[PDB]
Amino acid sequence: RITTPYMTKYERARVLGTRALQIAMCAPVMVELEGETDPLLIAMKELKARKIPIIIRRYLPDGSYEDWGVDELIIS
Amino acid sequence: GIVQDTLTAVRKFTKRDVFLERGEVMNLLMFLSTWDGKVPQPAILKPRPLWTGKQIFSLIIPGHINCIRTHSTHPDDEDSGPYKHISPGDTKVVVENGELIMGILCKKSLGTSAGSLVHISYLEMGHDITRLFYSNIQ
Amino acid sequence: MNAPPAFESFLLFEGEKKITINKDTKVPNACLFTINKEDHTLGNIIKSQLLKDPQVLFAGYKVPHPLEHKIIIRVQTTPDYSPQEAFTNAITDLISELSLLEERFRVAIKDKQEG
Amino acid sequence: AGILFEDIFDVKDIDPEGKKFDRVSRLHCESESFKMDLILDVNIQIYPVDLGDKFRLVIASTLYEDGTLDDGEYNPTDDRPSRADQFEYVMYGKVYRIEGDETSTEAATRLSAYVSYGGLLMRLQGDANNLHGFEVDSRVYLLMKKLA
Amino acid sequence: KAFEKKFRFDYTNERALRRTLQEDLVKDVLSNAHIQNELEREFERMREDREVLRVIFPTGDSKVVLPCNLLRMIWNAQKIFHINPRLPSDLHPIKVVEGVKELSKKLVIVNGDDPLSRQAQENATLLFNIHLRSTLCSRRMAEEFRLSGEAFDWLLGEIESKFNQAIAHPGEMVGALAAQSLGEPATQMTL
């Protein structure tokens, strides 16, 4: 896998956006939520806990579909 | 955004003569959002407890930034002669360890530029930290 | 339109409590009294009377936004004294001073009218 | 104790460069019996100083005269220790620089310790044998008192 | 001559050495020929990089734009570790040499294992590496920055992290950035 091991800020925005949309549409929370009833806050907790159930196709410019698990990408 | 309103004022606040009293200092610390609840020790204990403008500003400055700018009216014959780290006109800025030690601030030190304490804050401390630093100055 | 009626700078609505106390957690013996429908009139005298107690290490007030009508008064005392008592004693000593001032003004008047 | 330094200075000048600030003036002093130069910004509104006054400088690391350190936070109440309040003027600063005339080979015979009391700068410059309690980033107390 | 006076690491004074290094290190720097020849390798590397710079910047303007303020990280380190600049340092000069040598291998813009990839890597970080080796010198870090054993390790880790944060993020709209940043100065020019 020849790609930056860090999570792009664009990738981070899209992961948190889609994860919070799922959580708003009744996807099971995978973190011990305490008092949190907002999708985006739960998505940030789930991300910082390395538990968002999403992987990324990083499409290289030739067409390589580089698969990265959101728990593998070094996040801020 | 640091408009003229709080740039002239921060050049007057950090002058060497701005001695704040106890009630004025407490009034000002009510508007620091990033304040740890500890009142600094006065610059002048006796005869009257009397803070300084640079103390309350060094309370605004975030983290442990280090910076050395040079206020706009700095005589250029100063760095060579004596008084180079003393600076009789208070024209050399030294924010050392997140803490304004000497020098009057201006936009040369608080704009966005090369150096520019707010820039070093954005680089070193972060990005929401400099949001708080802007709003606290104001 | 969006013009707040003039009476809602001093009139509590249902469920406002007129005062709430939050312990400030950054330091010991600090409280934060949020007073609804008050302004610098009542904030500044309480602050300046708290700053007269020798067992008060911090007294300050702020009006968060001028369009909202409430103040926050932060008090911090020495450990053998709670900020609730410092606040209470400030208000009691202000009330006592203004009672004295009222009767002194009545006497000064009644002497000026050459009663 | 905690006294990093102490001496009796005599003021030889108040504003040689001319007064830059109205409430702050810069004494240029020379000591007695230590052969030591001082430059000091002073709040001459609350503490007036003029030419030829002999004041007594003491630079300490704590005020408590039992040695226990200061914690550097405004506590105006506690007198559990008895302060060093035999003095009229008391500033509180941070040693921000210690220069010397040393060359790559030998050590410094004369030293310059620069302190900044909340922005009012002092430079205590003399022999390296009595300017040795100082160290950069050390919080220090300056206590002055005019002598009759 | 100033370049040699400032970047050489004499190691042949035994007085200026004991003034700036612990005694273990000052006897290790003179009682060794491997250490001294490595220090000479460092100075030769630095001199030929100087000749390279004289080609890249033929006008002599030394103000460049690089992704790590090194004179400010050295200051952050002197402050974080309370470096006393009046005391012999405990940082071994060979440790500076070897540490920046292994740091320059973690600052990877073009990931290699490939002759043209290795050349593109050496070009992509040719100026930052010249900088890094001329500021994390072994003569400067022992008589000018006076860092310690652990201040220097913190500084290496910090340089590497603040560099890896500076690498451009894929998907960045660099055309829009360039357009707006070339147009916003067009709001104060002449005519």
XYZ file of C-alpha atoms in Angstrom:
668
model
C 0.000 0.000 0.000
C 1.768 3.086 -1.331
C -0.264 5.825 0.316
C 0.068 8.321 3.111
C -0.577 6.503 6.404
C -2.343 9.583 7.780
C -6.043 10.287 7.430
C -6.558 13.235 5.107
C -8.697 16.009 6.523
C -11.080 15.397 3.631
C -11.276 11.720 4.583
C -11.809 12.658 8.219
C -14.627 15.022 7.321
C -16.333 12.424 5.153
C -15.915 9.592 7.651
C -17.379 11.639 10.497
C -20.170 12.910 8.272
C -21.261 9.481 7.060
C -20.805 7.876 10.467
C -23.003 10.478 12.124
C -25.576 10.091 9.364
C -25.653 6.350 9.996
C -25.969 6.883 13.749
C -28.852 9.249 13.051
C -30.395 6.440 10.988
C -30.228 3.845 13.795
C -26.912 2.272 13.215
C -25.666 0.723 16.462
C -23.250 2.846 18.419
C -19.987 1.014 19.051
C -18.703 3.186 21.912
C -19.761 3.594 25.534
C -21.770 6.751 24.950
C -22.269 8.750 28.137
C -24.852 11.528 28.030
C -24.225 12.060 24.307
C -27.354 12.323 22.166
C -25.863 14.098 19.129
C -24.805 12.085 16.059
C -21.654 14.081 15.302
C -20.367 14.007 18.878
C -20.842 10.240 18.953
C -19.040 9.987 15.623
C -16.072 11.923 17.005
C -15.982 9.697 20.081
C -16.224 6.581 17.923
C -13.393 7.844 15.725
C -11.092 8.829 18.587
C -11.779 5.390 20.044
C -10.660 3.781 16.750
C -14.016 2.052 16.355
C -15.750 3.496 13.290
C -16.713 0.475 11.116
C -15.662 1.933 7.767
C -12.850 1.324 5.297
C -11.677 3.611 2.504
C -10.903 2.998 -1.164
C -8.120 5.392 -1.899
C -8.364 5.376 -5.673
C -4.929 6.011 -7.083
C -4.852 7.816 -10.430
C -4.392 4.570 -12.361
C -7.203 2.698 -10.545
C -5.781 0.745 -7.553
C -8.565 0.868 -4.856
C -6.080 1.087 -1.902
C -8.017 -0.315 1.077
C -7.440 1.376 4.414
C -9.277 0.667 7.652
C -10.176 3.876 9.470
C -8.622 2.334 12.573
C -5.308 2.024 10.674
C -5.007 5.599 9.438
C -3.061 7.797 11.845
C -5.595 10.411 12.868
C -4.913 13.818 14.435
C -9.784 39.138 12.924
C -7.761 41.652 14.978
C -9.080 45.065 13.782
C -7.596 48.545 14.608
C -9.912 48.617 17.683
C -7.809 46.089 19.571
C -4.420 46.825 18.027
C -3.898 50.406 19.114
C -5.275 49.256 22.411
C -2.885 46.341 22.731
C -0.009 48.650 21.979
C -1.180 50.846 24.852
C -1.948 47.925 27.141
C 1.499 46.398 26.907
C 3.369 49.642 27.404
C 5.685 49.667 30.381
C 3.428 51.988 32.415
C 0.204 50.027 32.481
C -0.155 49.094 36.140
C -3.537 47.556 36.872
C -4.988 47.425 40.347
C -6.559 44.441 42.005
C -10.165 45.150 41.103
C -9.278 46.036 37.520
C -7.261 42.850 37.178
C -10.104 40.731 38.504
C -12.452 42.486 36.134
C -10.151 41.585 33.260
C -9.688 37.978 34.321
C -13.436 37.566 34.135
C -13.118 37.822 30.342
C -10.285 35.340 29.851
C -11.937 32.167 28.644
C -8.670 30.229 28.919
C -7.895 31.189 32.489
C -6.928 28.522 35.003
C -8.436 30.255 38.004
C -5.103 31.422 39.413
C -4.363 35.103 39.951
C -0.720 35.777 39.040
C 1.543 37.359 41.507
C 1.706 41.150 41.121
C 4.697 42.688 39.471
C 4.717 45.140 42.378
C 3.844 43.735 45.835
C 4.863 46.736 48.011
C 3.784 49.439 48.509
C 0.586 48.643 46.499
C -0.248 45.235 44.797
C -0.177 46.355 41.223
C -0.139 44.109 38.156
C 1.110 45.088 34.717
C -0.220 45.002 31.208
C 2.347 42.449 30.170
C 1.267 40.120 32.974
C -2.347 39.978 31.879
C -1.255 39.675 28.304
C 1.123 36.828 29.118
C -1.989 35.260 30.605
C -3.697 35.613 27.232
C -0.788 34.178 25.196
C -1.420 30.451 24.707
C 0.743 27.512 25.539
C 4.479 28.016 25.780
C 5.104 30.003 22.606
C 8.546 31.512 22.070
C 8.941 34.577 19.863
C 11.210 37.575 19.347
C 9.781 40.394 17.261
C 10.882 44.035 17.264
C 8.414 46.871 17.845
C 7.988 49.400 15.069
C 10.000 52.286 16.554
C 13.080 50.274 17.532
C 16.264 52.325 17.195
C 18.561 50.373 14.933
C 21.623 51.594 16.831
C 20.424 49.670 19.888
C 21.263 46.061 19.036
C 24.931 46.995 18.648
C 25.513 49.163 21.707
C 24.785 48.279 25.314
C 21.195 47.923 26.517
C 20.566 45.324 23.858
C 18.629 43.024 26.191
C 17.432 46.015 28.212
C 16.083 48.308 25.510
C 15.325 51.637 27.201
C 12.315 52.277 24.986
C 10.801 48.814 25.395
C 10.931 48.160 21.677
C 12.149 44.547 21.558
C 9.461 41.920 22.072
C 10.384 38.655 23.782
C 7.542 36.222 24.379
C 9.511 33.538 26.139
C 7.750 30.460 27.481
C 4.312 31.735 26.602
C 4.849 34.903 28.514
C 5.504 38.452 27.399
C 8.790 39.422 29.025
C 9.471 42.742 27.342
C 8.445 44.826 24.425
C 5.276 46.520 23.281
C 2.994 44.582 20.978
C 1.526 45.987 17.762
C 0.346 44.515 14.484
C 3.918 43.670 13.571
C 3.708 41.227 16.481
C 0.024 40.336 16.387
C -0.925 40.468 12.736
C -0.404 37.495 10.511
C 3.101 37.637 9.093
C 6.473 35.958 9.362
C 6.899 35.757 13.103
C 3.774 37.455 14.286
C 3.011 35.805 17.629
C -0.409 34.749 16.370
C 1.272 32.916 13.495
C 3.665 31.090 15.834
C 0.601 30.256 17.884
C -1.153 28.770 14.874
C 1.931 26.770 13.973
C 2.910 25.568 17.442
C -0.222 25.416 19.578
C -2.908 24.572 17.134
C -5.883 26.053 15.375
C -8.705 26.426 17.889
C -6.136 27.685 20.369
C -5.460 30.640 18.112
C -9.184 31.236 17.783
C -9.302 31.547 21.559
C -6.209 33.744 21.538
C -7.849 36.158 19.110
C -11.087 36.357 21.054
C -9.301 36.739 24.393
C -7.136 39.578 23.148
C -10.278 41.280 21.971
C -40.822 42.285 15.029
C -37.633 41.120 16.793
C -37.872 43.976 19.266
C -37.684 42.556 22.776
C -40.367 44.194 24.913
C -38.771 46.761 27.158
C -39.870 44.986 30.349
C -37.867 41.837 29.793
C -34.642 43.400 31.021
C -35.952 43.296 34.597
C -38.904 40.852 34.607
C -38.324 37.163 35.252
C -40.240 34.705 33.129
C -41.588 31.459 34.525
C -38.808 29.209 35.754
C -35.775 31.481 35.939
C -34.752 31.250 39.609
C -33.216 34.740 39.624
C -29.975 33.166 40.863
C -28.084 29.932 40.366
C -24.829 28.802 41.944
C -22.274 26.626 40.196
C -19.169 25.473 41.929
C -16.171 26.424 39.840
C -14.040 23.332 39.433
C -10.742 24.803 38.246
C -9.985 26.059 41.772
C -11.077 25.303 45.318
C -13.671 27.403 47.107
C -14.863 29.161 43.981
C -18.473 29.693 43.028
C -20.131 31.236 40.024
C -23.463 32.952 40.702
C -25.560 33.617 37.630
C -28.157 36.280 38.387
C -30.980 36.792 35.915
C -32.435 40.209 35.161
C -29.615 42.201 36.679
C -27.015 44.559 35.306
C -24.012 46.513 36.468
C -26.107 48.289 39.078
C -26.334 45.228 41.267
C -23.228 43.509 40.004
C -20.742 46.259 40.634
C -21.749 46.969 44.231
C -21.704 43.299 45.146
C -18.298 42.957 43.548
C -16.881 45.960 45.337
C -18.253 44.784 48.657
C -16.863 41.296 48.189
C -13.504 42.849 47.472
C -13.692 44.252 50.967
C -13.785 40.916 52.732
C -10.253 39.881 53.716
C -11.231 36.262 53.102
C -12.130 36.784 49.461
C -9.339 36.127 47.013
C -11.272 36.774 43.818
C -14.437 38.728 43.195
C -15.483 39.666 39.741
C -18.593 40.093 37.663
C -19.375 40.197 34.000
C -22.358 40.850 31.800
C -21.844 38.110 29.198
C -23.755 39.852 26.425
C -25.395 43.282 26.766
C -28.543 42.169 24.951
C -29.121 39.365 27.436
C -29.999 40.634 30.884
C -27.992 38.671 33.412
C -24.668 38.838 35.200
C -22.161 36.266 36.379
C -20.326 36.878 39.642
C -17.330 34.681 40.342
C -16.203 34.484 43.956
C -13.264 32.655 45.477
C -12.509 32.712 49.184
C -10.031 31.233 51.607
C -10.697 27.621 52.605
C -12.261 28.442 55.984
C -14.991 30.505 54.308
C -17.422 29.560 51.618
C -18.303 31.855 48.723
C -21.982 31.482 49.605
C -21.288 33.139 52.942
C -19.093 35.755 51.317
C -21.915 36.630 48.940
C -24.516 36.660 51.702
C -22.372 38.900 53.877
C -21.734 41.265 50.983
C -25.441 41.715 50.439
C -26.086 42.148 54.149
C -23.406 44.800 54.494
C -24.670 46.651 51.440
C -28.194 46.611 52.855
C -26.831 47.931 56.140
C -24.904 50.715 54.438
C -27.906 51.824 52.414
C -30.117 51.793 55.490
C -27.597 54.058 57.175
C -27.422 56.250 54.080
C -31.197 56.541 53.937
C -31.574 57.720 57.511
C -28.601 60.070 57.213
C -30.187 61.592 54.117
C -33.521 62.024 55.862
C -31.792 63.858 58.689
C -29.729 65.992 56.312
C -32.882 66.951 54.413
C -34.867 67.741 57.535
C -32.040 70.002 58.647
C -31.702 71.691 55.260
C -35.397 72.518 55.268
C -34.531 74.082 58.564
C -37.017 71.818 60.296
C 17.118 32.551 54.063
C 16.706 32.742 50.320
C 18.667 35.945 49.718
C 20.330 35.571 46.342
C 21.920 38.978 46.670
C 21.927 42.087 48.805
C 23.731 45.406 48.895
C 23.393 49.165 49.365
C 23.169 51.087 46.116
C 23.465 54.786 45.417
C 21.584 56.304 42.500
C 23.891 58.047 40.050
C 21.252 58.746 37.408
C 17.495 58.574 36.865
C 16.951 58.987 33.113
C 20.138 59.459 31.139
C 18.455 58.636 27.842
C 15.555 60.905 28.754
C 12.242 59.855 30.200
C 10.490 57.433 27.850
C 7.597 56.573 30.184
C 5.798 58.824 32.594
C 5.113 56.491 35.529
C 8.280 54.391 35.162
C 11.811 55.705 35.413
C 15.128 53.946 34.992
C 17.591 54.319 37.840
C 21.250 53.769 37.056
C 22.817 52.846 40.370
C 26.232 51.835 41.635
C 26.669 49.842 44.777
C 28.847 50.338 47.817
C 31.554 47.763 48.668
C 30.563 45.243 45.975
C 31.626 47.228 42.884
C 28.371 46.438 41.155
C 26.250 48.174 38.535
C 22.472 48.196 38.598
C 19.930 49.305 36.042
C 16.388 49.255 37.290
C 12.968 50.307 36.074
C 10.980 51.637 39.022
C 7.393 52.826 39.380
C 8.275 56.327 40.535
C 4.656 57.279 40.968
C 4.026 55.067 43.974
C 7.708 54.923 44.973
C 9.505 58.169 44.175
C 13.282 58.047 43.787
C 15.639 60.915 42.968
C 19.354 61.442 42.532
C 21.732 60.473 45.279
C 19.349 58.360 47.283
C 21.030 55.431 48.959
C 18.642 52.533 48.859
C 19.202 48.982 50.009
C 18.572 46.325 47.393
C 17.860 42.736 48.350
C 17.147 40.067 45.764
C 15.599 36.969 47.241
C 14.110 33.770 45.941
C 11.294 33.791 48.473
C 9.705 36.238 50.864
C 9.174 33.850 53.750
C 12.604 34.136 55.461
C 12.356 30.508 56.463
C 13.407 29.309 53.010
C 10.179 27.651 51.870
C 9.413 28.355 48.238
C 6.739 30.627 46.927
C 4.407 28.840 44.451
C 4.193 32.187 42.633
C 0.464 32.771 43.110
C -1.133 35.837 44.642
C -2.051 34.950 48.180
C -2.668 38.221 50.026
C -4.073 36.591 53.142
C -1.716 33.962 54.539
C 0.892 35.105 57.016
C 1.557 31.567 58.295
C 5.131 32.501 57.424
C 6.257 35.982 58.403
C 7.174 37.892 55.247
C 10.274 39.975 54.623
C 8.374 43.264 54.974
C 11.175 45.423 56.280
C 11.171 46.950 52.806
C 9.251 49.733 51.102
C 9.357 48.570 47.478
C 8.849 44.962 46.426
C 8.740 43.794 42.828
C 8.482 40.216 41.601
C 10.147 39.045 38.419
C 11.849 36.321 36.402
C 15.543 36.101 35.562
C 15.443 35.994 31.795
C 19.122 36.084 30.850
C 22.593 35.756 32.366
C 25.366 37.039 30.150
C 29.056 36.974 30.931
C 32.372 38.064 29.499
C 33.645 34.505 29.199
C 35.650 33.351 26.202
C 35.534 29.825 24.789
C 38.485 28.848 26.981
C 38.051 30.350 30.464
C 35.019 31.159 32.612
C 33.173 34.423 33.146
C 34.756 36.828 35.604
C 31.929 39.357 35.381
C 28.280 38.479 34.923
C 25.106 40.324 33.972
C 21.809 39.023 35.317
C 18.727 40.438 33.615
C 15.385 40.260 35.406
C 11.976 41.471 34.226
C 9.507 42.373 36.947
C 6.314 41.986 34.989
C 7.881 44.006 32.228
C 10.005 46.461 34.191
C 13.542 45.377 33.473
C 16.550 45.244 35.758
C 20.143 44.421 34.885
C 22.433 43.580 37.785
C 25.973 43.474 36.489
C 29.082 42.763 38.492
C 31.467 40.031 39.605
C 30.560 36.443 38.899
C 31.111 35.375 42.504
C 28.112 37.157 44.022
C 25.901 36.984 40.918
C 25.869 33.201 41.141
C 22.590 32.544 42.909
C 20.769 33.635 39.773
C 19.731 31.269 37.015
C 17.574 31.776 33.951
C 13.822 31.207 34.314
C 14.141 31.646 38.085
C 11.431 33.673 39.775
C 12.964 36.262 42.036
C 11.940 39.068 44.397
C 13.397 42.559 44.490
C 13.058 44.442 47.752
C 14.221 48.037 48.049
C 14.267 50.500 50.906
C 15.688 54.007 51.002
C 18.332 54.670 53.633
C 18.414 57.768 55.811
C 37.003 31.115 6.721
C 33.936 32.144 8.708
C 32.160 29.048 7.429
C 35.047 26.943 8.666
C 35.377 28.865 11.928
C 31.688 28.309 12.636
C 30.909 24.758 11.429
C 34.180 22.828 11.821
C 34.294 21.253 15.325
C 37.997 21.747 16.061
C 38.187 18.865 18.623
C 41.795 20.042 19.044
C 41.704 22.489 21.946
C 41.085 20.503 25.171
C 40.180 23.842 26.740
C 37.259 24.935 24.600
C 36.185 21.300 24.793
C 36.017 20.990 28.576
C 34.178 24.312 28.625
C 31.376 22.838 26.494
C 31.261 19.060 27.080
C 31.295 16.713 30.048
C 34.640 15.139 30.866
C 33.614 11.697 29.609
C 32.864 13.196 26.218
C 35.934 15.412 26.058
C 38.213 12.480 26.688
C 36.176 10.414 24.230
C 36.575 13.073 21.509
C 40.374 13.231 21.748
C 41.160 9.600 22.688
C 39.387 8.429 19.529
C 40.184 8.554 15.827
C 36.849 7.141 14.697
C 34.944 9.996 16.313
C 37.289 12.573 14.820
C 37.104 11.143 11.325
C 33.305 11.042 11.519
C 33.318 14.689 12.557
C 35.496 15.430 9.543
C 33.051 13.532 7.335
C 30.289 15.749 8.687
C 32.195 18.909 7.893
C 32.982 17.731 4.373
C 29.341 16.859 3.809
C 28.494 20.361 4.991
C 31.065 22.055 2.770
C 29.947 20.294 -0.384
C 26.334 21.091 0.473
C 27.512 24.680 0.707
C 28.807 24.439 -2.838
C 25.417 23.029 -3.869
C 23.617 25.967 -2.269
C 25.906 28.363 -4.096
C 24.487 26.841 -7.296
C 20.807 26.837 -6.294
C 20.943 30.397 -4.914
C 23.453 32.205 -7.097
C 22.238 35.587 -5.897
C 23.066 34.910 -2.266
C 19.636 35.403 -0.700
C 19.590 33.007 2.230
C 15.964 33.493 3.240
C 14.227 30.290 2.170
C 10.875 28.728 2.984
C 11.141 25.321 4.648
C 8.698 23.162 6.597
C 10.055 23.265 10.140
C 11.361 26.214 12.106
C 14.492 24.648 13.464
C 15.813 27.636 15.367
C 12.467 27.698 17.159
C 12.297 23.998 17.929
C 15.773 24.302 19.361
C 14.391 27.082 21.527
C 11.336 25.093 22.553
C 13.750 22.370 23.595
C 16.045 24.699 25.513
C 12.940 25.780 27.391
C 11.231 22.424 27.877
C 14.353 20.873 29.356
C 15.680 23.912 31.232
C 18.928 23.905 29.331
C 21.530 25.821 31.302
C 23.789 27.492 28.707
C 26.453 28.055 31.367
C 27.281 24.373 31.908
C 29.175 21.688 29.996
C 26.723 19.762 27.851
C 26.297 15.993 27.996
C 25.444 15.558 24.309
C 28.022 13.524 22.450
C 28.985 15.123 19.113
C 28.866 11.739 17.417
C 25.305 11.478 18.667
C 24.369 14.667 16.856
C 25.988 13.410 13.666
C 24.373 9.980 13.750
C 21.022 11.304 14.927
C 20.553 13.765 12.116
C 21.829 11.074 9.756
C 19.030 8.725 10.835
C 16.491 11.546 10.991
C 17.061 12.460 7.366
C 15.915 8.930 6.527
C 12.521 9.318 8.215
C 11.665 12.487 6.293
C 10.323 10.660 3.259
C 8.468 12.498 0.507
C 8.953 9.871 -2.225
C 8.956 6.350 -0.841
C 11.853 4.515 -2.411
C 13.384 1.081 -2.983
C 13.812 2.247 -6.583
C 16.709 4.142 -8.224
C 14.542 6.875 -9.720
C 12.443 6.923 -6.562
C 15.584 7.332 -4.492
C 16.705 10.166 -6.744
C 13.330 11.873 -6.526
C 13.531 11.517 -2.764
C 17.005 13.001 -2.555
C 15.838 15.922 -4.690
C 12.562 16.493 -2.846
C 14.386 17.030 0.444
C 17.679 18.382 -0.766
C 17.291 21.849 0.647
C 15.641 20.923 3.927
C 18.354 18.369 4.546
C 21.110 20.878 3.842
C 19.391 23.135 6.342
C 18.927 20.395 8.927
C 22.572 19.373 8.725
C 23.805 22.950 8.937
C 21.698 23.873 11.966
C 21.787 20.585 13.843
C 25.525 20.796 13.369
C 27.787 19.125 15.862
C 29.790 22.277 16.459
C 26.697 24.440 16.842
C 24.786 22.000 19.030
C 27.733 21.950 21.399
C 28.728 25.586 21.547
C 25.614 27.477 20.504
C 22.483 25.505 21.320
C 24.007 23.518 24.169
C 21.218 20.949 24.073
C 21.376 17.916 26.311
C 21.058 14.201 25.705
C 17.274 14.101 25.951
C 16.552 17.558 24.606
C 18.155 16.393 21.386
C 16.086 13.214 21.159
C 12.938 15.228 21.777
C 14.097 17.615 19.072
C 14.631 14.844 16.538
C 11.207 13.379 17.205
C 9.696 16.838 16.987
C 11.347 17.676 13.670
C 10.142 14.418 12.201
C 6.565 14.879 13.378
C 6.299 18.523 12.348
C 7.647 17.508 8.952
C 5.220 14.636 8.454
C 2.411 17.049 9.268
C 3.628 19.437 6.553
C 3.320 16.984 3.672
C 0.536 17.929 1.269
C -2.716 16.099 1.769
C -4.103 14.151 -1.186
C -7.267 15.618 -2.556
C -6.155 19.114 -1.623
C -7.477 21.593 -4.162
C -4.186 23.222 -4.984
C -5.465 24.910 -8.111
C -8.108 26.835 -6.202
C -5.597 27.761 -3.507
C -3.177 29.014 -6.133
C -5.849 30.980 -7.954
C -7.163 32.742 -4.867
C -3.682 33.372 -3.497
C -2.515 34.940 -6.737
C -5.696 36.956 -7.083
C -5.849 38.401 -3.576
C -2.615 40.374 -4.196
C -4.188 41.695 -7.393
C -6.385 43.839 -5.137
C -3.646 46.357 -4.229
C -1.459 46.716 -7.336
C -1.114 49.615 -9.751
C -3.400 50.743 -12.582
